[PDB]
Amino acid sequence: SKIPNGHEIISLFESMYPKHLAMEGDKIGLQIGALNKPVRHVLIALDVTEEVVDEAIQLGANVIIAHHPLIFNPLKAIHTDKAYGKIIEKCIKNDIAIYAAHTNVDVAKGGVNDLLAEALGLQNTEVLAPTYAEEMKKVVVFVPVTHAEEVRKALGDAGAGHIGNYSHCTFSSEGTGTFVPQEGGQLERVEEVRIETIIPASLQRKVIKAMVTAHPYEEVAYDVYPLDNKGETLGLGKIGYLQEEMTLGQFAEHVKQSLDVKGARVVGKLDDKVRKVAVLGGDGNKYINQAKFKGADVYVTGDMYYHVAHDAMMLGLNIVDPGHNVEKVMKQGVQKQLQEKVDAKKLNVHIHASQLHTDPFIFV
C-alpha cells in the first residue's frame, strides 16, 4: 500500500463529483492549504465549524472535504479575534487543507438528493430541476480492417458508446479513402473502415488518446461532430413516489424519523393525501414551481421563506421543511463512496464522516 498525496485523493473524488456539474457562480475546489503532501486520513464534513477542525486534529486528518464552502464571500480580511477568522487560523496553523464540494455534490448521481430520496424510500426518481446535460459528440475514425477490431475495443473500454444499459456501442461500414501524399501529386486509394461512436464531451480527451494509441497510424484522421443529442439530464433535487399513500401529517413524521430530525415545519392541510414527493436538500425556495409543474403533492426542502410558503399554498403545493441540515446524509454517503475508490486503488487512507451535529436550530 502507498500513502497518497492530497491531489490523488481529490482526483479520485472528482471522478464521482466533477467540477463542471457545479452551478454558475458556485465556489468549489481547494480553498485553504495545499494538496501536495502525504494524506493518511481525510474528513468528510457538511459545515467546517471550529469543532469540526478540532475533530480533524484528533484524527490526524490533514484534508477536510466539505459540502458548504468555508470561504463563500471572498475574504477582505482575516480577523483572528473573530470566530470565523479563528477557523481559518486553526486550519492554517495545523496544515489542514480545506476542499469545497458544493453544488457538484447536489447535482451528481449518488449525491445529496439521491441520498435523501433513498432515505425517504422514494421510488422511480427523476431529476427535479435540470441544470446540466452533457453535450454529445460523434467520433468518426478511419482505420484499416487489420486494426479495426482493436480500435473499437479501445474506444469502448475507454467509455465511448456507453448509453443506457448498453456499452461498447459502435457502427462500422467499409469504404474507400483517397489521399495524395505531399512534399515530405500521386493519388493513392485504400479500402478502409469508418467507425463511429457517440461520446459525452467530458470523455473526449481520454477516448481520443486511447483511440490514437490503438490506431496503427501516427497521423490519424478522425472527425468529432457536435450532435443535438444530450447526455443524461442532471440537476437539483429528486422527484419520486412513496411506497404507500399517506396524509401530509404522517408523511411529515416519516420525514423526521427518516431524516433524523426532532422537528419540522409543514405547509398545507395535514390531512391532505400525498403520494409523489419532491426533495431538494439545502435552500430550495426557488424550485416550488418546478416541484408543482412535475406534479408533487409535497415538497421537502430547507430554509422555507414566509413569502415563498404563501406562494406554495397558492400553487396547491404542500411542504415539509426538516431544515437545511438534513444534507448531513452526505457525510456518511461520500465517506462510503470515497473509501470504496481509495480501496480499489490500494491507497493507504482512512476516510471519516464527521460526527458533529451542525444544525444551528433547536425546535421548542
46: DSSP letter: S
CB of 132 to its own copies, least distance (A): 18
Binders of its own copies in range 31-90 (CB under 8 A): 31-36, 47, 49, 68, 71-85, 88-89
State which residue, 279 or 342, has the beta carbon closest to Zn ion: 279
Rg of the chain taking only CA atoms, in angstroms: 25
165 binds, among its own copies, Zn ion, none (CB under 5 to 8 A by kind): its own copies
Query: In sequence order, which residues have a C-beta less than 8 Å from that of residue 49 and are 6 or more positions away?
Result: 87, 356, 358
**Cell numbers found for residue 43:** 474528513
106 binds, among Zn ion, its own copies, none (CB under 5 to 8 A by kind): Zn ion
Phi/psi of residue 224, each to 5°?
-125, 115
CB of 353 to its own copies, least distance (A): 19
- Distance CA(348)–CA(212), nearest Å, equals 34
One character per residue 128-167, x = contact with its own copies (rule: CB under 8 A) = ---------xx---x---------xx--x----x-xxxxx
Sign of the four-CA dihedral 339, 342, 347, 353: negative
Query: Does 178 help bind its own copies (rule: CB under 8 A)?
Result: yes
**Site size for Zn ion, by CB under 5 A?**
3
Stretch that binds its own copies, among 112-120, 296-304, 336-344, 345-353 (CB under 8 A): 296-304
221 binds, among Zn ion, its own copies, none (CB under 5 to 8 A by kind): its own copies
Strands 188-200 and 123-143, bridge-based pairing: antiparallel
Query: Does 226 help bind its own copies (rule: CB under 8 A)?
Result: yes
**Site size for its own copies, by CB under 8 A?**
108
Binders of Zn ion in range 98-157 (CB under 5 A): 106
State which residue, 69 or 339, has the beta carbon closest to its own copies: 69
Candidates 111, 282, 322, 333; binder of Zn ion (CB under 5 A) is: 282
Candidates 283, 286, 343, 348; binder of its own copies (CB under 8 A) is: 283
167 binds, among its own copies, Zn ion, none (CB under 5 to 8 A by kind): its own copies
Sign of the four-CA dihedral 257, 262, 267, 271: positive
Q: Classify residue 141 as exposed, middle or buried by CB count within 10 Å of its CB (0-12, 13-18, 19+).
A: buried
State which residue, 224 or 350, has the beta carbon closest to its own copies: 224
State which residue, 10 or 28, has the beta carbon closest to Zn ion: 28
Sign of the four-CA dihedral 232, 236, 237, 239: negative
Query: In sequence order, which residues have a C-beta less than 8 Å from that of residue 353 and are 6 or more positions away?
Result: 43, 44, 331, 332, 334, 335
Cα pseudo-dihedral 234, 236, 241, 247, rounded to 10: -170
Query: Does 344 help bind its own copies (rule: CB under 8 A)?
Result: no
Candidates 29, 110, 130, 231; binder of its own copies (CB under 8 A) is: 29
- Distance CA(271)–CA(307), nearest Å, equals 23
Query: Does 205 help bind its own copies (rule: CB under 8 A)?
Result: no
State which residue, 2 or 363, has the beta carbon closest to its own copies: 363
Cβ-contact 163, 169 below 8 angstroms: yes
Closest CA to 363 of 291, 280, 266: 266
Give me the residues that bind Zn ion (CB under 5 A), please: 106, 282, 327
